[PDB]
Write a protein that binds this DNA or RNA. Structure first.
Ligand SMILES: [Mg+2]
Ligand SMILES: [Mg+2]
Length: 1268
RNA sequence: AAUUUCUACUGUUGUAGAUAGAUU
């Protein structure tokens, strides 16, 4: 059996960055501290933190200015309003496309306007902090203007005192602009036109515009129905400052005057809002404002509606109240480093909750109590109020009705009888694909659903209303608990102390968590009402404007928990040490940007090799010529070997730029012919000719002529002449890109220069060069074991075997870092003193050490770090169309392939099954045990040992689980190569498992991702260097990871199949239970049992038999289930039940006589008694239960009611080795069967491009049943 | 209970596997 992956190696190139520690050598540290370089860069990091804040202030200013300047045409806004309001009442896919496009053209206008502005162009690049040509810095100009105009910008900021400091901080970065290269990338979004929730455009159109339109419609209707509601004269006198607007967009006339409430609500005048200042003005109009002298609040539109509602004593008028506009991004309104932060932030949050007053001017508790009481009182319109259809509704159904499926089944069935009573995608749109469901729909559906069910089993809508009537009671507990928190807060109020996370405080922490949990859970219950836009649907719906106005107002204030919850939790679970570090550049703006020899004086970083040890060194800025050609000539000696780095990147643009520019032109002497070639670009099929010259058709002789000129010029070039290019004969290539590729592949070359030890020692001794040793425990003298993979890669960079045909390449843009001391150095385990060994199975229970052992020693001392990127498979091309290649490879080699199916068990962390092409199981075992002869570690026992109330334990379990996964991906890899398999996982994107498992969906998703990334480059440490699977040749079975969503049905060699119906199936017969006896009602039970083909007693065998065809009741077949086994009945203690004896008892109890083996079907249908059918369906369900488990015994198994051709029943305990041994093994096995289907579809695919990797349940059932 | 970093460790100044850094 050859390895089907034997030739899948060196397939595609990918980048990786290796990490190492730098150990100062000789007098290096002494000189560095003497110059104080580290402290300077440390201050530079703090100045970075402040500098981000300054650049934020400039961003905020620019947002205001540009948005104030921006105008948008009335036609587009009116198109928006029209499609929007049309979309409210009727949801048409046409209006969906129309709404998206009408929205997108608004965003396009806003973005296209801002991007052409001058302040924006220099905003994200080097020119922001740097002075171009003569021009000074835009940011500095802004700061200087802010000092000249006497505005105090930074008074709010604690870090920055005054504008002079900000100017000095910004000037400090003038050559250091690269410090912000990451920062600017993140801020690039702020102005983006895409779907990002953090954008100025997104807030304008996606957030504020609908609210404004609603406010407009409420204003117009208010004028119509309530003409004297607003006092129009008085609002001008009070709010005049806000009523003043610079430009009227309706008439496009520029004049400064108070605007009429009619004018402010003109759709064209939205442009005066949409920026922070206008948003503030508008909001003041809506809600009113305060003047410091007055002592009373100036009334707003809303208060006028409120008071006029009092005069006429009408509650309807409040339905016209208006929602506040969202504040613009980066507006002037965080991280918890100590106990004071936890205490103060929590106190502030809950004080905000308690003191908040809604639009109705009552507390959140009072508002919600009044609100939900109204919903129960029926006063509200249930046609206009919606439940979100996500897990929130399922959770509601389970909460009140004790079944998650009731509501969904009820609405589906109700709508089915509604729109299609007589007899498909249409009903789905109305129910299953509906993003939000109306309360009216739920009530009607439930009533009609309850009409046919016994009063015993009925589920009532009044229960749901009572459920939400109950919620405000939670507030009382909150109010109580925070009072206790007050006393807890005082002891932890200390400013610098961390003691909250010590052991003595755990009880208080429990109190804190319980409080936060109560609030967070309260939010989760309310989350169902929230209206959240989801992609692929606008989710604009006709709604009660008062209900959602007050509810959204409460919800958004309450929703602040999740940031608070996450921050406090993160604080409690933080590790003893700290990972904080800051960048080290020694006096040089560009440190590692390239290793090139020509750029050595500029970049200042060089690499040495001494014996098997590797050293990095950095020349002092003043003396960077240390290694110039004369010096390496004078000092050549055998002590250290400096690395000579030569690279020709980007051949396509590099060759022409060098040969065809400036003085080089005269040197390289391009001929009149080849100059004609270049100008008209005849050498390129499609390329830009030199501007001013017209593109010509590709001519092959011309291209080859150009190649010849390039070769000649390479021979003349001083540096590239020594690269020793070996080129195919110029006549051989069909395209210029092939020559470029040869140039690029041979362009990277690494050589060494010997340097005397005395020269290195002296030059570091004088402070001229800083020498560090690149180190990890694999480089220690004591380390005889197997090295880290990264250690193998780093060693491989300089290996001669690698240098012949380059696999591992050295990359530029490396970085050095400094990490200060995070913890006291404590001797946890003194030497010569024995230690208990934590591993349960370890033979030696004690270990004795001659040297001290220090917990988390790496963080006890300051340390230097080095991050060096490298390129893997440099000569190989980029990765594309990988799945097609893999599928073809399987197509040819499918005779030899296997299926490795992995599943997260209920009693097992993970389980796998190797399956034959025919479907037999070659091997199955648990992943619980990770071990070699030295050590076996059982993660199942370890994990079960830990199991989780407090935050710290939950975190420890999660972290351990993720690390255990890091172990398991290797086992999977070994099995893949060994057995020639393909990995089959359950699909976690859609169709993920329902139940309770030892490994959560989120963690298992991590496992799938980790296995993808591991199979990107797969190396076995013991495999031979040159041979496949070795350091040079690593199996590449997967394309690089992209996103969880794009994993899809197949990634590389890994296939994701739906997990549905995996664990509930009979292995031999493929039996599935798709007919679920629920005992809906007596009559329905009679109909349900009547559909059975025949129900009788088998006299010879001794068990009852139920025979049926699914056609009468998704699944198809003739089954004839049996009662044979004993079933353990599912926390609370287990009892073993015998279905045969139970049925004997039930039938004997009634008139029915089974003892003759006559068919009972008619007699069963004869009884009208509730009790008979209730117990009968219960017994039948017991018969249908395949998985039986004892909670304490940790034993579960699968047995199936249907019989094979021999009449033997499948039992996991009596099962052979090629059949699943336990209940979880079944699920793994059937995941493999779905993979077998995918294997077959790969095997049989034809010239048609599309391979169908999606497995429908019908296909699943048919395949599984007849195959054996 | 030692680590470029992570998990489990003692597998002995480290052991097995994992490990794309930076940035927000
Ligand atoms: Mg090792
Ligand atoms: Mg540890």
């Amino acid at each position: 059996n050859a390895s089907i992956y034997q030739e899948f190696v060196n397939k595609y190139s990918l980048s990786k960055t290796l990490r190492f520690e730098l150990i100062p050598q000789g007098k290096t540290l002494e000189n560095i501290k003497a110059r104080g370089l580290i402290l300077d860069d440390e201050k530079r990091a703090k100045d970075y933190k402040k500098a981000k804040q300054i650049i934020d202030k400039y961003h905020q200013f620019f947002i205001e200015e540009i948005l104030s300047s921006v105008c948008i045409s009335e036609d587009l806004l009116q198109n928006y309003s029209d499609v929007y309001f049309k979309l409210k009442k009727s949801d048409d896919d046409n209006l969906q496309k129309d709404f998206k496009s009408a929205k997108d053209t608004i965003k396009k206008q806003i973005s296209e306007y801002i991007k052409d502005s001058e302040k924006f162009k220099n905003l994200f690049n080097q020119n922001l902090i740097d002075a171009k040509k003569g021009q000074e810095s835009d940011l500095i100009l802004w700061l200087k203007q802010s000092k000249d105009n006497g505005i105090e910008l930074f008074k709010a900021n604690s870090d920055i005192t005054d504008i002079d400091e900000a100017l000095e901080i910004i000037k400090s970065f003038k050559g250091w602009t690269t410090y912000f290269k990451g920062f600017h990338e993140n801020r690039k979004n702020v102005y983006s036109s895409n779907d990002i929730p953090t954008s100025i455009i997104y807030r304008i159109v996606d957030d504020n515009l609908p609210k404004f339109l609603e406010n407009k419609a409420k204003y117009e209707s208010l004028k119509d129905k309530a003409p004297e509601a607003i006092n129009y004269e008085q609002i001008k006198k009070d709010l005049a400052e806000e009523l003043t607007f610079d430009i009227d967009y309706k008439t496009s006339e520029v004049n400064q005057r108070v605007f009429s409430l009619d004018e402010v609500f003109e759709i064209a005048n939205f442009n005066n809002y949409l920026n922070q200042s206008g948003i503030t003005k508008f909001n003041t109009i809506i809600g009113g404002k305060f003047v410091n002298g007055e002592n009373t609040k100036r009334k707003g539109i809303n208060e006028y509606i409120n008071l006029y509602s009092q005069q006429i004593n009408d509650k309807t008028l409040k339905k016209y109240k208006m929602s506040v506009l969202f504040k613009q991004i980066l507006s002037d309104t965080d991280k918890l480093e100590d106990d004071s932060d936890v205490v103060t932030t929590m106190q502030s949050f809950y004080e905000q909750i308690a003191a908040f007053k809604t639009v109705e001017e009552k507390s959140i508790k009072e508002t919600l109590s009044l609100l939900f009481d109204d919903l129960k009182a029926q006063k509200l319109d249930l046609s206009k109020i919606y439940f979100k259809n996500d897990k929130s509704l399922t959770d509601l159904s389970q909460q009140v009705f004790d079944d998650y499926s009731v509501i969904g089944t009820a609405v589906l069935e109700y709508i089915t009888q509604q729109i299609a009573p007589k007899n498909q995608e249409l009903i789905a749109k109305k129910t299953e694909k509906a993003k939000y469901l109306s309360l009216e729909t739920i009530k009607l559906a439930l009533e009609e659903f309850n009409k046919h069910r016994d009063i015993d089993k009925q589920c009532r809508f009044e229960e749901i209303l009572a459920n939400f009537a109950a919620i405000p009671m939670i507030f009382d507990e909150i109010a109580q608990n925070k009072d206790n928190l007050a006393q807890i807060s005082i002891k932890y109020q200390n400013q610098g102390k961390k003691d909250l996370l010590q052991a003595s405080a755990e009880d208080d922490v429990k109190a804190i968590k319980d409080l936060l949990d109560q609030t967070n859970n309260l939010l989760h219950k309310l989350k169902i009402f929230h209206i959240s836009q989801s992609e692929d649907k606008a989710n604009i719906l006709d709604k009660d404007e008062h209900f959602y106005l007050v509810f959204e107002e409460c919800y958004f204030e309450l929703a602040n928990i999740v940031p608070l919850y996450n921050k406090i939790r993160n604080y409690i679970t933080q590790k003893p040490y700290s990972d904080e570090k800051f960048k080290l550049n020694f006096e040089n703006s560009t440190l590692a940007n390239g290793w090139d020899k020509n750029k050595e004086p500029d970049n200042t970083a060089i690499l040495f090799i001494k014996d098997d040890k590797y050293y990095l060194g950095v020349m002092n800025k003043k003396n960077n010529k240390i290694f110039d050609d004369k010096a390496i000539k004078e000092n050549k000696g055998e002590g250290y070997k400096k690395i000579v780095y030569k690279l020709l990147p980007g051949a396509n643009k590099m060759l022409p730029k060098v040969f065809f520019s400036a003085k080089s032109i005269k040197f390289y002497n391009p001929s009149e012919d080849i100059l004609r070639i270049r100008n008209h670009s005849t050498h390129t099929k499609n390329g830009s000719p030199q501007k001013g010259y017209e593109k010509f058709e590709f001519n092959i002789e011309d291209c080859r002529k150009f190649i010849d000129f390039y070769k000649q010029s390479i021979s003349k070039h001083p540096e590239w002449k020594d690269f020793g290019f070996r080129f195919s004969d110029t006549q051989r290539y069909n395209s210029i890109d092939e020559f470029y590729r040869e140039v690029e592949n041979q362009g990277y070359k690494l050589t060494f220069e010997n340097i005397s030890e005395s020269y290195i020692d002296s030059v570091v001794n004088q402070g001229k060069l800083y020498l560090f040793q690149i180190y990890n425990k694999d480089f220690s003298a004591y380390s005889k074991g197997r090295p880290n993979l990264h250690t193998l890669y780093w060693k491989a960079l300089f290996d001669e075997r690698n240098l012949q045909d380059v696999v591992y390449k050295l990359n530029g843009e490396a970085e050095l870092f400094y990490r200060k001391q995070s913890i006291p150095k404590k001797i946890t385990h003194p030497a010569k003193e024995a230690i208990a060994n934590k591993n349960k199975d370890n033979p030696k229970k004690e270990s004795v050490f001659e040297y001290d052992l220090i917990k988390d020693k790496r963080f006890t001392e300051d340390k230097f770090f080095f991050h060096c990127p490298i390129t893997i498979n440099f000569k190989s091309s980029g990765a594309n169309k990988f799945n097609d290649e893999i599928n073809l490879l399987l197509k040819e080699k499918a005779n030899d392939v296997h299926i490795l199916s992995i599943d997260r068990g209920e009693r097992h962390l993970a389980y796998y099954t190797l399956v034959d092409g025919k479907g037999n199981i070659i091997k199955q075992d648990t992943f619980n045990i990770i071990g070699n002869d030295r050590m076996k570690t059982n993660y199942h026992d370890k994990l079960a040992a830990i199991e989780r109330k407090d935050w710290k334990k939950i975190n420890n379990i999660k972290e351990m689980k993720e690390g255990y996964l890091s172990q398991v991906v290797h086992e999977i890899a070994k099995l893949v190569i060994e057995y020639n398999a393909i990995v089959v996982f359950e699909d976690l994107n859609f169709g993920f498992k329902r139940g309770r498992f030892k490994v959560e969906k989120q963690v298992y998703q991590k496992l799938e991702k980790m296995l993808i990334e591991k199979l990107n480059y797969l190396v076995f440490k013991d495999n031979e260097f040159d041979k496949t699977g070795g350091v040079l040749r690593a199996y590449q079975l997967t394309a690089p990871f992209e996103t969880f969503k794009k994993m899809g049905k197949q990634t590389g060699i890994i296939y994701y199949v739906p997990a549905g119906f995996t664990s509930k199936i009979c292995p031999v017969t493929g039996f599935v239970n798709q007919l679920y006896p629920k005992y809906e009602s007596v009559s329905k039970s009679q109909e349900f049992f009547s559909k059975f083909d025949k129900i009788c007693y088998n006299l010879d065998k001794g068990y009852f038999e139920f025979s049926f065809d699914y056609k009468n009741f998704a699944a198809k077949g003739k089954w004839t289930i049996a009662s044979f086994g004993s079933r353990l009945i599912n926390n609370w203690d287990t009892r073993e039940v015998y279905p045969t004896k139970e049925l004997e008892k039930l039938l004997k109890d009634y008139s029915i006589e089974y003892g003759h083996g006559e068919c009972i079907k008619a007699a069963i249908c004869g009884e009208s008694d509730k009790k008979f059918f209730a117990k009968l369906t219960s017994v039948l369900n017991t018969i249908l239960q395949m998985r039986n488990s004892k909670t304490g015994t940790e034993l579960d198994y699968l047995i199936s009611p249907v019989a094979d051709v021999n009449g033997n029943f499948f039992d996991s305990r009596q099962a052979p080795k090629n059949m699943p041994q336990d209940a979880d093994a079944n699920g793994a096995y059937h995941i493999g069967l779905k993979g077998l289907m995918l294997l077959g579809r790969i095997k049989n695919n034809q010239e048609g491009k599309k391979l169908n990797l999606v497995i429908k349940n019908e296909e699943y059932f048919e395949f599984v049943q007849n195959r054996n």
